[PDB]
Amino acid sequence: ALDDIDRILVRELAADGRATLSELATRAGLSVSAVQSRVRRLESRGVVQGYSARINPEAVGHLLSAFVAITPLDPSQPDDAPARLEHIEEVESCYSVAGEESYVLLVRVASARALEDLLQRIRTTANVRTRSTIILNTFYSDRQHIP
Amino acid sequence: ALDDIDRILVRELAADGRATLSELATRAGLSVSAVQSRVRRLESRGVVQGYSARINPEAVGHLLSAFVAITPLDPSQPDDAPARLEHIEEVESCYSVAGEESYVLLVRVASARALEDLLQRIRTTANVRTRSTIILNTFYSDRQHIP
Numbered sequence: 409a410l411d412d413i414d415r416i417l418v419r420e421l422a423a424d425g426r427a428t429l430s431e432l433a434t435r436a437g438l439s440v441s442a443v444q445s446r447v448r449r450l451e452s453r454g455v456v457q458g459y460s461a462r463i464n465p466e467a468v469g470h471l472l473s474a475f476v477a478i479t480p481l482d483p484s485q486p487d488d489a490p491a492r493l494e495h496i497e498e499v500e501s502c503y504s505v506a507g508e509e510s511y512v513l514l515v516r517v518a519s520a521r522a523l524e525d526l527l528q529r530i531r532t533t534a535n536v537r538t539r540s541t542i543i544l545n546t547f548y549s550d551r552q553h554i555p
Numbered sequence: 556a557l558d559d560i561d562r563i564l565v566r567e568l569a570a571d572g573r574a575t576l577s578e579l580a581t582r583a584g585l586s587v588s589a590v591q592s593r594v595r596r597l598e599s600r601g602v603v604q605g606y607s608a609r610i611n612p613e614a615v616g617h618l619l620s621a622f623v624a625i626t627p628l629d630p631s632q633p634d635d636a637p638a639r640l641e642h643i644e645e646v647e648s649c650y651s652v653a654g655e656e657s658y659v660l661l662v663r664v665a666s667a668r669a670l671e672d673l674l675q676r677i678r679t680t681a682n683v684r685t686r687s688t689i690i691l692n693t694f695y696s697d698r699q700h701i702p
Protein backbone atom coordinates (compact mmCIF):
# COMPACT_ATOMS: atom_id res chain seq x y z
CA ALA A 409 0.00 0.00 0.00
CA LEU A 410 2.30 2.80 -1.47
CA ASP A 411 0.45 5.17 -3.93
CA ASP A 412 2.00 7.22 -6.78
CA ILE A 413 2.39 10.15 -4.36
CA ASP A 414 4.43 8.25 -1.82
CA ARG A 415 6.54 6.86 -4.58
CA ILE A 416 7.40 10.54 -5.55
CA LEU A 417 8.17 11.53 -2.01
CA VAL A 418 10.66 8.64 -1.28
CA ARG A 419 12.16 8.97 -4.68
CA GLU A 420 12.87 12.66 -3.84
CA LEU A 421 14.00 12.01 -0.32
CA ALA A 422 16.32 9.21 -1.58
CA ALA A 423 17.88 11.73 -3.88
CA ASP A 424 17.80 14.48 -1.31
CA GLY A 425 17.13 13.78 2.27
CA ARG A 426 17.19 17.47 3.10
CA ALA A 427 14.46 18.24 0.42
CA THR A 428 12.10 20.60 2.27
CA LEU A 429 8.48 20.24 2.87
CA SER A 430 7.68 23.20 0.61
CA GLU A 431 9.94 21.76 -2.12
CA LEU A 432 8.40 18.25 -1.80
CA ALA A 433 4.82 19.78 -1.83
CA THR A 434 5.34 21.79 -4.90
CA ARG A 435 6.65 18.55 -6.57
CA ALA A 436 3.91 16.13 -5.50
CA GLY A 437 1.33 18.94 -6.15
CA LEU A 438 0.17 18.96 -2.46
CA SER A 439 0.05 21.30 0.51
CA VAL A 440 2.95 21.42 2.86
CA SER A 441 0.65 19.88 5.56
CA ALA A 442 -0.44 17.03 3.31
CA VAL A 443 3.29 16.40 2.71
CA GLN A 444 4.27 16.57 6.28
CA SER A 445 1.78 14.03 7.16
CA ARG A 446 2.42 11.59 4.24
CA VAL A 447 6.16 11.81 5.35
CA ARG A 448 5.33 10.97 8.96
CA ARG A 449 3.19 8.11 7.87
CA LEU A 450 6.04 6.73 5.69
CA GLU A 451 8.37 7.10 8.60
CA SER A 452 6.15 5.21 11.00
CA ARG A 453 5.50 2.27 8.70
CA GLY A 454 9.12 1.50 8.28
CA VAL A 455 9.32 2.85 4.75
CA VAL A 456 11.79 5.68 5.61
CA GLN A 457 14.15 4.43 8.32
CA GLY A 458 16.00 7.65 8.95
CA TYR A 459 18.09 10.30 7.26
CA SER A 460 21.75 10.28 7.02
CA ALA A 461 24.49 12.36 5.49
CA ARG A 462 26.69 10.50 3.02
CA ILE A 463 30.10 10.93 4.49
CA ASN A 464 33.20 10.07 2.50
CA PRO A 465 35.05 7.53 4.55
CA GLU A 466 38.58 8.40 3.17
CA ALA A 467 38.21 12.04 4.18
CA VAL A 468 37.65 10.91 7.76
CA GLY A 469 40.42 8.36 8.15
CA HIS A 470 38.99 5.05 6.92
CA LEU A 471 41.50 4.40 4.26
CA LEU A 472 40.82 0.59 4.06
CA SER A 473 37.48 -1.08 3.76
CA ALA A 474 36.78 -4.78 3.46
CA PHE A 475 34.08 -7.36 3.15
CA VAL A 476 34.58 -9.97 5.77
CA ALA A 477 32.60 -13.21 5.50
CA ILE A 478 32.19 -15.01 8.86
CA THR A 479 31.20 -18.45 9.75
CA PRO A 480 30.69 -20.14 13.29
CA LEU A 481 33.61 -21.93 14.81
CA ASP A 482 30.98 -24.09 16.48
CA PRO A 483 27.61 -23.93 14.67
CA SER A 484 25.54 -25.14 17.72
CA GLN A 485 23.94 -22.01 19.77
CA PRO A 486 21.42 -19.98 17.85
CA ASP A 487 23.43 -17.34 16.21
CA ASP A 488 24.60 -14.58 18.40
CA ALA A 489 26.95 -12.88 16.03
CA PRO A 490 25.10 -9.89 14.74
CA ALA A 491 24.22 -9.00 18.40
CA ARG A 492 27.73 -9.57 19.66
CA LEU A 493 29.37 -7.41 16.85
CA GLU A 494 26.72 -4.61 17.02
CA HIS A 495 29.08 -2.87 19.37
CA ILE A 496 32.28 -2.88 17.20
CA GLU A 497 32.00 0.49 15.65
CA GLU A 498 34.12 -0.34 12.66
CA VAL A 499 31.51 -2.76 11.48
CA GLU A 500 29.14 -0.85 9.29
CA SER A 501 26.81 -3.57 7.81
CA CYS A 502 26.06 -7.13 8.78
CA TYR A 503 24.01 -9.48 6.55
CA SER A 504 23.24 -13.28 6.81
CA VAL A 505 23.69 -14.90 3.50
CA ALA A 506 23.01 -18.20 1.65
CA GLY A 507 25.86 -20.51 0.90
CA GLU A 508 28.83 -21.73 2.82
CA GLU A 509 29.44 -18.70 5.08
CA SER A 510 26.80 -17.14 7.45
CA TYR A 511 27.29 -13.48 7.51
CA VAL A 512 29.02 -10.84 5.45
CA LEU A 513 30.25 -7.66 7.09
CA LEU A 514 31.44 -4.44 5.51
CA VAL A 515 34.19 -3.13 7.69
CA ARG A 516 36.34 0.11 7.61
CA VAL A 517 39.62 0.82 9.23
CA ALA A 518 42.71 3.10 9.13
CA SER A 519 45.28 0.70 7.70
CA ALA A 520 46.47 -2.79 7.04
CA ARG A 521 47.62 -3.12 10.59
CA ALA A 522 44.35 -1.77 11.96
CA LEU A 523 42.70 -4.45 9.79
CA GLU A 524 44.68 -7.28 11.49
CA ASP A 525 43.65 -6.02 14.82
CA LEU A 526 40.03 -5.82 13.87
CA LEU A 527 39.99 -9.39 12.40
CA GLN A 528 41.21 -10.63 15.71
CA ARG A 529 38.57 -8.75 17.61
CA ILE A 530 35.87 -10.19 15.31
CA ARG A 531 37.40 -13.72 15.52
CA THR A 532 37.24 -13.45 19.19
CA THR A 533 34.09 -11.70 19.84
CA ALA A 534 31.85 -13.88 17.63
CA ASN A 535 33.90 -16.99 17.71
CA VAL A 536 33.86 -17.29 14.00
CA ARG A 537 36.37 -17.93 11.17
CA THR A 538 36.83 -15.07 8.77
CA ARG A 539 37.42 -14.75 4.96
CA SER A 540 38.45 -11.19 4.03
CA THR A 541 38.07 -9.35 0.74
CA ILE A 542 39.75 -5.94 0.62
CA ILE A 543 37.96 -3.26 -1.35
CA LEU A 544 40.49 -1.49 -3.66
CA ASN A 545 37.95 1.04 -4.94
CA THR A 546 34.32 2.03 -4.66
CA PHE A 547 32.93 3.21 -8.02
CA TYR A 548 29.48 4.26 -6.68
CA SER A 549 27.40 3.10 -3.79
CA ASP A 550 23.99 3.42 -2.15
CA ARG A 551 22.36 4.46 -5.22
CA GLN A 552 18.74 3.56 -4.04
CA HIS A 553 16.22 2.57 -6.78
CA ILE A 554 12.47 3.20 -6.40
CA PRO A 555 10.56 1.39 -9.25
CA ALA B 556 42.64 19.28 8.32
CA LEU B 557 39.43 18.03 9.93
CA ASP B 558 39.20 20.46 12.85
CA ASP B 559 37.43 18.26 15.46
CA ILE B 560 34.54 20.78 15.47
CA ASP B 561 33.98 19.54 11.87
CA ARG B 562 34.35 16.12 13.50
CA ILE B 563 31.25 16.69 15.87
CA LEU B 564 29.38 17.98 12.87
CA VAL B 565 29.71 14.86 10.69
CA ARG B 566 28.86 12.55 13.66
CA GLU B 567 25.78 14.62 14.16
CA LEU B 568 24.70 14.66 10.45
CA ALA B 569 25.47 10.94 9.92
CA ALA B 570 23.10 9.85 12.66
CA ASP B 571 20.59 12.50 11.49
CA GLY B 572 20.68 14.08 8.10
CA ARG B 573 17.72 16.31 8.78
CA ALA B 574 19.05 17.79 12.12
CA THR B 575 18.60 21.52 11.34
CA LEU B 576 21.24 24.25 10.83
CA SER B 577 20.18 25.52 14.37
CA GLU B 578 19.60 22.36 16.62
CA LEU B 579 23.17 21.49 15.47
CA ALA B 580 24.77 24.82 16.56
CA THR B 581 23.36 24.14 20.12
CA ARG B 582 25.09 20.65 20.82
CA ALA B 583 28.10 22.09 18.67
CA GLY B 584 28.42 25.56 20.62
CA LEU B 585 28.40 27.83 17.48
CA SER B 586 26.41 30.63 15.66
CA VAL B 587 23.75 29.30 13.19
CA SER B 588 26.08 31.34 10.81
CA ALA B 589 29.48 29.56 11.24
CA VAL B 590 27.63 26.24 11.36
CA GLN B 591 26.20 27.17 7.99
CA SER B 592 29.64 27.97 6.45
CA ARG B 593 31.63 24.80 7.43
CA VAL B 594 28.78 22.59 6.18
CA ARG B 595 29.04 24.53 2.84
CA ARG B 596 32.88 23.94 2.81
CA LEU B 597 32.40 20.31 4.00
CA GLU B 598 30.25 19.63 0.92
CA SER B 599 32.70 21.54 -1.28
CA ARG B 600 35.75 19.60 0.06
CA GLY B 601 34.07 16.24 -0.78
CA VAL B 602 33.64 15.25 2.90
CA VAL B 603 29.80 15.23 2.87
CA GLN B 604 28.82 13.79 -0.52
CA GLY B 605 25.06 14.23 -0.16
CA TYR B 606 21.95 13.55 1.97
CA SER B 607 19.76 10.52 1.66
CA ALA B 608 16.72 9.15 3.23
CA ARG B 609 17.24 5.56 3.98
CA ILE B 610 14.47 3.60 2.35
CA ASN B 611 13.54 0.06 3.43
CA PRO B 612 13.92 -2.04 0.16
CA GLU B 613 11.16 -4.59 0.77
CA ALA B 614 8.75 -1.82 1.41
CA VAL B 615 9.26 -0.87 -2.21
CA GLY B 616 9.08 -4.51 -3.43
CA HIS B 617 12.81 -5.33 -3.53
CA LEU B 618 12.30 -8.76 -1.81
CA LEU B 619 15.56 -10.26 -2.98
CA SER B 620 18.92 -8.57 -2.67
CA ALA B 621 22.29 -10.20 -3.59
CA PHE B 622 26.03 -9.59 -3.78
CA VAL B 623 27.08 -10.46 -7.25
CA ALA B 624 30.72 -11.05 -7.96
CA ILE B 625 31.80 -10.41 -11.48
CA THR B 626 34.99 -11.08 -13.49
CA PRO B 627 35.46 -10.09 -17.11
CA LEU B 628 35.53 -12.87 -19.75
CA ASP B 629 38.15 -11.38 -22.00
CA PRO B 630 41.22 -9.90 -20.30
CA SER B 631 42.27 -8.41 -23.58
CA GLN B 632 39.34 -5.91 -23.91
CA PRO B 633 39.52 -2.62 -21.94
CA ASP B 634 38.14 -3.40 -18.57
CA ASP B 635 35.36 -0.89 -18.17
CA ALA B 636 32.70 -2.90 -16.39
CA PRO B 637 31.67 -0.26 -13.74
CA ALA B 638 30.86 2.20 -16.49
CA ARG B 639 29.05 -0.37 -18.69
CA LEU B 640 26.85 -1.32 -15.73
CA GLU B 641 26.27 2.15 -14.36
CA HIS B 642 23.05 2.54 -16.42
CA ILE B 643 21.50 -0.55 -14.96
CA GLU B 644 19.65 0.75 -12.07
CA GLU B 645 19.21 -2.03 -9.77
CA VAL B 646 22.93 -2.14 -9.22
CA GLU B 647 23.10 -0.20 -6.05
CA SER B 648 26.86 -0.43 -5.52
CA CYS B 649 29.90 -1.52 -7.43
CA TYR B 650 33.39 -2.05 -5.81
CA SER B 651 36.63 -3.51 -7.14
CA VAL B 652 38.07 -5.97 -4.89
CA ALA B 653 41.16 -8.12 -4.16
CA GLY B 654 39.66 -11.53 -4.04
CA GLU B 655 38.72 -14.20 -6.49
CA GLU B 656 36.53 -11.95 -8.57
CA SER B 657 37.25 -8.50 -10.05
CA TYR B 658 34.27 -6.59 -8.65
CA VAL B 659 31.38 -7.04 -6.21
CA LEU B 660 27.92 -5.50 -6.85
CA LEU B 661 25.04 -5.12 -4.49
CA VAL B 662 21.84 -5.66 -6.42
CA ARG B 663 18.11 -5.53 -5.61
CA VAL B 664 15.36 -7.16 -7.35
CA ALA B 665 11.68 -8.26 -7.05
CA SER B 666 12.23 -11.94 -6.90
CA ALA B 667 14.50 -14.95 -7.78
CA ARG B 668 13.12 -14.79 -11.35
CA ALA B 669 13.94 -11.15 -11.75
CA LEU B 670 17.52 -11.97 -10.54
CA GLU B 671 18.07 -14.63 -13.14
CA ASP B 672 17.15 -12.07 -15.54
CA LEU B 673 19.22 -9.24 -14.21
CA LEU B 674 22.16 -11.63 -14.38
CA GLN B 675 21.63 -12.50 -18.01
CA ARG B 676 21.56 -8.73 -18.64
CA ILE B 677 24.71 -8.17 -16.52
CA ARG B 678 26.56 -10.94 -18.44
CA THR B 679 25.73 -9.55 -21.73
CA THR B 680 26.06 -5.95 -21.04
CA ALA B 681 29.63 -6.00 -19.42
CA ASN B 682 31.26 -9.06 -20.74
CA VAL B 683 31.42 -10.86 -17.34
CA ARG B 684 30.89 -14.14 -15.54
CA THR B 685 28.63 -13.71 -12.40
CA ARG B 686 28.86 -15.59 -9.04
CA SER B 687 26.14 -14.51 -6.73
CA THR B 688 25.33 -14.53 -3.06
CA ILE B 689 21.89 -14.12 -1.81
CA ILE B 690 21.18 -11.96 1.25
CA LEU B 691 18.61 -13.58 3.54
CA ASN B 692 18.48 -10.70 6.08
CA THR B 693 20.06 -7.26 6.79
CA PHE B 694 20.82 -6.86 10.46
CA TYR B 695 22.16 -3.27 10.13
CA SER B 696 23.43 -1.39 7.32
CA ASP B 697 25.25 2.06 6.91
CA ARG B 698 26.16 2.51 10.57
CA GLN B 699 28.68 5.26 9.70
CA HIS B 700 31.56 5.48 12.18
CA ILE B 701 33.54 8.63 12.88
CA PRO B 702 36.87 8.18 14.86
Ligand SMILES: N[C@@H](Cc1ccc(O)cc1)C(=O)O
Binds near residue numbers: 487691
Ligand atom coordinates in the same frame (compact mmCIF):
# COMPACT_ATOMS: atom_id res chain seq x y z
N1 LIG C 1 24.69 -20.29 5.26
C1 LIG C 1 23.34 -20.92 5.35
C2 LIG C 1 22.29 -19.93 5.84
C3 LIG C 1 22.58 -19.41 7.18
C4 LIG C 1 22.53 -18.05 7.43
C5 LIG C 1 22.82 -17.56 8.68
C6 LIG C 1 23.18 -18.42 9.68
O1 LIG C 1 23.48 -17.96 10.93
C7 LIG C 1 23.25 -19.76 9.46
C8 LIG C 1 22.96 -20.26 8.19
C9 LIG C 1 22.79 -21.57 4.09
O2 LIG C 1 23.10 -21.24 2.96
O3 LIG C 1 21.93 -22.43 4.24
